[PDB]
Amino acid sequence: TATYAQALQSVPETQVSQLDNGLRVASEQSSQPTCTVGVWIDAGSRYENEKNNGAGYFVEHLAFKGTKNRPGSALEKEVESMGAHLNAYSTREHTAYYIKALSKDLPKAVELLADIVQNCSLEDSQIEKERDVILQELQENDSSMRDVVFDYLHATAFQGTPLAQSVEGPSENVRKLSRADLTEYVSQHYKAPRMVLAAAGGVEHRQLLDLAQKHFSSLSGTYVEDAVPAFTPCRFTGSEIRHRDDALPLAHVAIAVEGPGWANPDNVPLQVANAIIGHYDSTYGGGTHMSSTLASVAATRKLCQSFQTFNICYAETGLLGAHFVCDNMSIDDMMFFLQGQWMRLCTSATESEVVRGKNILRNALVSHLDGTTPVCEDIGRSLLTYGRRIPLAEWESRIAEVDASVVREVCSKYFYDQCPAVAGLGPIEQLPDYNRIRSGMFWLRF
Amino acid sequence: AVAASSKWLEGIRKWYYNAAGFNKLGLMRDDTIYEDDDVKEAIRRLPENLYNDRVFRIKRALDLTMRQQILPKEQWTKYEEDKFYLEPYLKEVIRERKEREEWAKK
Amino acid sequence: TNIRKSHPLMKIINNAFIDLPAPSNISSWWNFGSLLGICLILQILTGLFLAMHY
Amino acid sequence: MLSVASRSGPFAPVLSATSRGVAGALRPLVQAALPATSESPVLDAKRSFLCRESLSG
Amino acid sequence: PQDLEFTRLPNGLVIASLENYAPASRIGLFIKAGSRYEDSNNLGTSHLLRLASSLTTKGASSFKITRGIEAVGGKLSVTSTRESMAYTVECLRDDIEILMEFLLNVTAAPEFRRWEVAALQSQLRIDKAVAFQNPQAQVLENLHAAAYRNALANSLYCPDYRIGKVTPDQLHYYVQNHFTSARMALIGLGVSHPVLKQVAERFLNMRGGLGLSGAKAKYRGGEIRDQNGDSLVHAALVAESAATGSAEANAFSVLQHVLGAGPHVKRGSNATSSLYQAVAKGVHQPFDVSAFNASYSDSGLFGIYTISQAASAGDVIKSAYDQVKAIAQGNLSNTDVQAAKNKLKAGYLMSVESSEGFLDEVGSQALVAGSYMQPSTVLQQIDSVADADVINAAKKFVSGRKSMAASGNLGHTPFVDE
Amino acid sequence: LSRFLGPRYRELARNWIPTASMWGAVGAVGLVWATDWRLILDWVPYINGKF
Amino acid sequence: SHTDIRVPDFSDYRRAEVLDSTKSSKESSDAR
Amino acid sequence: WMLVADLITLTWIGGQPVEHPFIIIGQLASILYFLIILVLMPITSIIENNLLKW
Ligand SMILES: CCCCCCCCCCCCCCCCC[C@@H](O)O[C@H](CO[C@H](O)CCCCCCCCCCCCCCC)COP(=O)(O)OCC[N+](C)(C)C
């Protein structure tokens, strides 16, 4: 019958084969009648210099809009025919082209990806569609709050770091770039082993490989002219960022201290902390006077509209942090408690709280891993990360690995006396000035 | 074991209730208990009519303590006329307290 | 535009004796404290002149 | 096929004691906002946007 | 890696249970109850109830419920369509045993403390105001009140004036009644089925037969136009449609999927929509034109749903209905018919595939049809649909009386007929 | 008064002991430094303010 | 909007040990 | 009120120079104080917590 061990071993593992041009292939055999083909290209926003800051977003917005093989309306009508849900996005660091689709269409789907990534046709009228749409879209993105807050957070916590600039990039840079340089972007970044083929489902692995072989074999691997990107272990500034805007109905805020990179052993216990802080939102009947302690007081005195703990991790470095919406008169108040929570994690972190956070974490994993697309993505990102699909038995051995001593140590190594990087979009006015904010990172009692 | 001795026990419960001053105040035993945070919330557990009753009765009692005249004994709360509608609410409160705290320490 | 309420100079006193609510039932016993206050003021003014010559 | 999700239209709200109070149904999206003029509602004691239930590391 | 042990009980309660190797142990206890069961006299007992899911039970303090959730790491959520409320709980396989009892204990007989109820009457305001934050939503609870006499015209949420006047007693009514043990149907998953009957019987004995379940509610032509300041009116036009589970309803499905359920190309285009191509050629871009169709067990409501500029919404809704007429002309290429059938299959495959859509699906047929089924049979009956029967459904939507709704600027958004 | 008792409280005091015990040592030695206490100054090789 | 905002230079105010854009801050938290 | 008696007793002893009979009255006065405040009254209030069945 049902037991945790079946939850452990019922999951099949991916294979990791590789092409001549270095493209690697992986796909768990999920025995799933539907399948989501995927290629998570490793190119991303942090890579480009300021000259071509938004190029990945541009290509993101014109992959299917024009391909060299067939007119884009033909490919469009094709996907409309197949009934497959095509999809694509781009993080700061993981550009992604993947097609949710039927297993029956699979060879058509993969070659269709070959039609996408390997080549694109760029009508200057189509490029004009790119430009006028995005230039009309910027203003819409300004209208959004959360993104703009995190945009300041990345724009300030890192500053001179390549990672700091906006993914879409500058309003002016976008109304400038040449078609040719875009092709240059494609030709310097969109090549293996940056690409990582994946498609968990009922797809048969060997057929997937053989199918890849007919298309992506053509794809380049050698870098042009021996030009070769190299990276930095980028510095983390602690500068605070305080945008105001009084006319906006609510203050809207995110704090973030420096975190571990997207390949760091301590990230799992840190994830537990995200549960330990326990995120909140206005809708819940789960708050009232319960939930997590900060969520509790936020629900008790109607502090927070909502707040969300988060643990972003880029390959070099992460960002431990929190994000609350807030009424003007309680701005400091949520803060007044929030930093304490970090110190609460420092000294006197009860193991009961620890197991609470671990359980919520495990639930977060299993909840993430439902469905085809999410796990195709897991295959599509874990390889870029550690490599590996990093199996859940390992993750949960690693969750059992955590102890309150280790928790207090890591929290000490990040929360206990460390310079905050804070960003706000409000109006903010109640919010304490940096030192005062900085004052809270260390208890006077300890 | 115990039998009619208990009858004597509620006997002195009755007589000492007479000995109690609030008996002469026309005040229910619920009326006299101190408003600790538990008790306040217990008052806010109350249905509106019992609220307005405890309110107005305590008010008349205070008015009589201001003009310093005692109630007529005819108007005394009788030992058997009284209700005890704070008690369930109270027991709820303490149980919630023990629950939240034993949950806390564990 | 109350000269009492609006004007800060005396507002604490409006917070104090001028218009603090107090229970309808109070014996002489609660008056005793204020008596003690007046006695204290008298101890000051008396001890003061004492020092004026002592 | 009688599930509302299989026949886009009527709402199937899923309010909860833990996860953010998700609700609503298509009423198709995405390609609406991209064409010019589409402010999207913002901040009136608003519940958190985007929502994150699929965390990893 | 299995098919479920489908159930009936002498007291009646489906307990489907798809045993799996899947870690995400879950159950989704269901109720046939919803907003439709109420009349004008007591709107919104429903929504306050769905929020009353958080309340203390006879079996546990609300403290012990909320703590009992978060500590184990498991969690709960409440789906509640008009046709069915749907309690749901999710967790680890060795941890389901306690949590399952919670929802049982949740669905047992929680006391409806008056202070707690007035306290959640606070929650009602926020939760309603944020639920309707969507411009689309502004049409939908509206639109159902536009095309219906009562039950299906009921709002999922109590109107704000009703809120304080919503009472615990009405909750006692709707719970003591419509929450029938028969109407309800548990849907286990990661747990083995036979044990699921066991603990369920702790509660399954509760509650007597049926409930009021009257007032079928029937179509009316009534226009509703709220008028707001939005630049982008979202006009929608609907004739009543056959529903549900009828082959004709399948024809409505093929019909709307000719338009498409929604875009398949994010940050792109959707040419396979027929009406959208019909309008965009005649109208400047800032709009959307898309399929819509209510499909209640009692009745359905097919119609165009049309996001639009207030400057020229009428050109959009007219060109769209013109295209619908073009299908109703008998004027139909068969290519996009089969393509639409393929869309039927695809969308159904995805909606089935995710565990949420899977379980909600399984309950959605089990609550009414009472028949657990592999999807492939559904694919067979859905590919069985006649190509001309599409022309039939088009003829019906052109035929039936047309309730219309379009909250927004209402500058140039002409009433149905006149 | 019984609330002070508890499974976390034992662990909690266990945790807080180093910080507050350190203060006592700091407070004690500092207080000796402030009153310029005698007999311990006998025991210091360096700080003998006495000849 | 959120795009065209930028952080103007502070390097002249920065400590020499963190003055460059490549180095770890955490390496310098101790000395600083 | 018995405590009132104990304290006034301490005053009247306070006028009285140290003497044996007042030594016995001395320790008796002290112990009387201790038991009157520290212990007795709360136990009484417990007893009427029973009588009032609090
Ligand atoms: C330090 C230890 C001290 C121990 C003893 C303390 C004793 C305290 C005594 C002081 C307390 C106040 C005394 C109570 C007086 C009763 C009130 C009486 O004065 O009437 C008031 C009237 O007071 C005056 O109107 C106040 C304004 C006028 C003041 C003008 C001063 C005139 C004489 C001052 C002489 C100063 C000469 C200085 C030359 C350089 C109004 O109050 P009220 O009880 O409601 O009367 C209602 C009747 N109405 C309608 C007529 C009003």
Automatic annotation (TrEMBL), chain C:
The chain crosses the membrane at residues 29-51. Component of the ubiquinol-cytochrome c reductase complex (complex III or cytochrome b-c1 complex) that is part of the mitochondrial respiratory chain. The b-c1 complex mediates electron transfer from ubiquinol to cytochrome c. Contributes to the generation of a proton gradient across the mitochondrial membrane that is then used for ATP synthesis. Heme b 1 binds at residues 30, 33-34. The cytochrome bc1 complex contains 11 subunits: 3 respiratory subunits (MT-CYB, CYC1 and UQCRFS1), 2 core proteins (UQCRC1 and UQCRC2) and 6 low-molecular weight proteins (UQCRH/QCR6, UQCRB/QCR7, UQCRQ/QCR8, UQCR10/QCR9, UQCR11/QCR10 and a cleavage product of UQCRFS1). This cytochrome bc1 complex then forms a dimer. Heme b 2 binds at residue 30. Heme b 3 binds at residue 43. This is Cytochrome b. The chain holds residues 2 to 55 of 379 of the full protein. Ubiquinone-10 binds at residue 34. Belongs to the cytochrome b family. It is found in: Mitochondrion inner membrane.
UniProtKB/TrEMBL annotation, chain D:
Belongs to the Rieske iron-sulfur protein family. The lineage of its organism: Eukaryota, Metazoa, Chordata, Craniata, Vertebrata. The gene is UQCRFS1. It is found in: Membrane. This is Ubiquinol-cytochrome c reductase, Rieske iron-sulfur polypeptide 1. It comes from the Eukaryota. It comes from Sus scrofa.
Automatic annotation (TrEMBL), chain F:
Signal peptide: none annotated. Its main location: mitochondrion. InterPro entries: Single_a-helix_sf, UQCR. Pfam families: UCR_6-4kD. The chain crosses the membrane at residues 20-40. It is a single-pass membrane protein. It is found in: Mitochondrion inner membrane. The keyword Transmembrane helix applies. It comes from the Eukaryota. GO terms for biological process: mitochondrial electron transport, ubiquinol to cytochrome c. Keywords: Electron transport, Membrane, Mitochondrion, Mitochondrion inner membrane, Respiratory chain, Transmembrane, Transmembrane helix, Transport. One of its GO terms (cellular component) is respiratory chain complex III. Gene3D superfamilies: 1.20.5.220. Belongs to the UQCR11/QCR10 family. Component of the ubiquinol-cytochrome c oxidoreductase (cytochrome b-c1 complex, complex III, CIII), a multisubunit enzyme composed of 11 subunits. The complex is composed of 3 respiratory subunits cytochrome b, cytochrome c1 and Rieske protein UQCRFS1, 2 core protein subunits UQCRC1/QCR1 and UQCRC2/QCR2, and 6 low-molecular weight protein subunits UQCRH/QCR6, UQCRB/QCR7, UQCRQ/QCR8, UQCR10/QCR9, UQCR11/QCR10 and subunit 9, the cleavage product of Rieske protein UQCRFS1. This is Cytochrome b-c1 complex subunit 10. It comes from Sus scrofa (Pig). The gene is UQCR11.
TrEMBL record, chain H:
It is found in: Mitochondrion inner membrane. The chain crosses the membrane at residues 1-15, 21-43. Component of the ubiquinol-cytochrome c reductase complex (complex III or cytochrome b-c1 complex) that is part of the mitochondrial respiratory chain. The b-c1 complex mediates electron transfer from ubiquinol to cytochrome c. Contributes to the generation of a proton gradient across the mitochondrial membrane that is then used for ATP synthesis. Belongs to the cytochrome b family. The cytochrome bc1 complex contains 11 subunits: 3 respiratory subunits (MT-CYB, CYC1 and UQCRFS1), 2 core proteins (UQCRC1 and UQCRC2) and 6 low-molecular weight proteins (UQCRH/QCR6, UQCRB/QCR7, UQCRQ/QCR8, UQCR10/QCR9, UQCR11/QCR10 and a cleavage product of UQCRFS1). This cytochrome bc1 complex then forms a dimer. This is Cytochrome b. The lineage of its organism: Eukaryota, Metazoa, Chordata, Craniata, Vertebrata.
